[PDB]
Amino acid sequence: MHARSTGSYSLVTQQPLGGKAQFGGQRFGEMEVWALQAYGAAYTLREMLTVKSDDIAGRSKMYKNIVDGKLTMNVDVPESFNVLRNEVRALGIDMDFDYSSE
Amino acid sequence: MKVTLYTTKYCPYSLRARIALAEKKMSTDIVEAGDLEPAMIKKITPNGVFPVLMEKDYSINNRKALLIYIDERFPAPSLLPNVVNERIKIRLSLDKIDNEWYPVLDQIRKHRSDQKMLESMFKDLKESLLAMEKAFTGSEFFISSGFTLADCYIAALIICLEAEGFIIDDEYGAIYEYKKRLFARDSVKKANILLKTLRTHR
Amino acid sequence: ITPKAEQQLTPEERLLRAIFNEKASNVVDSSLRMPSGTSGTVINVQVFENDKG
């Protein structure tokens, strides 16, 4: 049955554990993302990727809103992307966000 | 963590900041503004303030609040009195020194080009020091039971005036009681220059 | 029971302890419990004591 609502997250990626060993939970496949793109349900795809998995600020805010019942959405950034930028930053190549007026 | 301070030679506030750092006993890197490349010196501050100090995420170029920020950042023995009333009085005294000290140093430094004009300023300064002579007596460094930031402010003026060839100890009126004591503090005795000389320079 | 230190309780928690005169435990409990949805009876129990004591 493997029923899970809220579970502990991986320390390195802040992401849910899998296989039902502790709280388990179902990983979302890349192919499933392609099917979502074919559907055109961007709102479902954007929410699942950030608040549902690695958004630390989003998950707490989402839980408070669900308990409150009021409607609000916060998806500033995904932590995995920041971890990837830090890994690239350690190497000589530099990656940073920028604003282009051109 | 690592903190560095940028200072300009012959600046009273820069000396005050160095003395405060010595009292705080926090290890810091001191870099002369002149040694840095001129374009690089302009880059750090567009306005160009010689005494600012350096931090990884923050920079302060304001001397008026710089001493207060240095005191708040470090929880080491404070330069301000514990008693609320003394703390309030000390701030007013600091404002009094800051509000009208331009004539004492700036006017003599640039305005008094004539040797007689420097001499005319010196007599008035001596009379003002004599008037200040009838003031606090027997205070350890000022109107406080413990060493205070205001005492640090006096040290910068004393060294700057001495560099101006105006040295008064027994001719400065009855302020000799605290002038000798102020030099006693290790941080204050850093104004100017066989084994001892080499070790001291190191 | 496993001990804990440096609890650093927040001020609201401190006020709650003061209102009910509730002390803060320096120890925590980590007992072994059967997982939910599992029911059974204890047929056998095994215990091993310390060595040199």
């Binding site: 496949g29 192919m31 499933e32 392609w34 099917a35 559907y39 308990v67 | - | -």
Partner: protein, 49 residues
């Protein structure tokens, strides 16, 4: 009146909880997916009873 009280009542599987769950899920959609999502048709949304 409290999150902890609600969790404790939920733990005991109180009878009133089932009716509230039925009201909450009455008009709420759910997504069913399979391990091999070859095409978008594989993922679909149904109303749970």
């Amino acid at each position: 009146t409290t999150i902890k009280q609600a969790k404790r009542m939920v733990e005991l599987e109180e009878a009133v909880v089932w009716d509230i769950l039925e009201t909450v899920i009455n008009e709420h959609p759910v997504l069913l997916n399979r391990a091999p999502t070859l095409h978008r048709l594989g993922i679909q949304a149904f109303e749970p009873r």
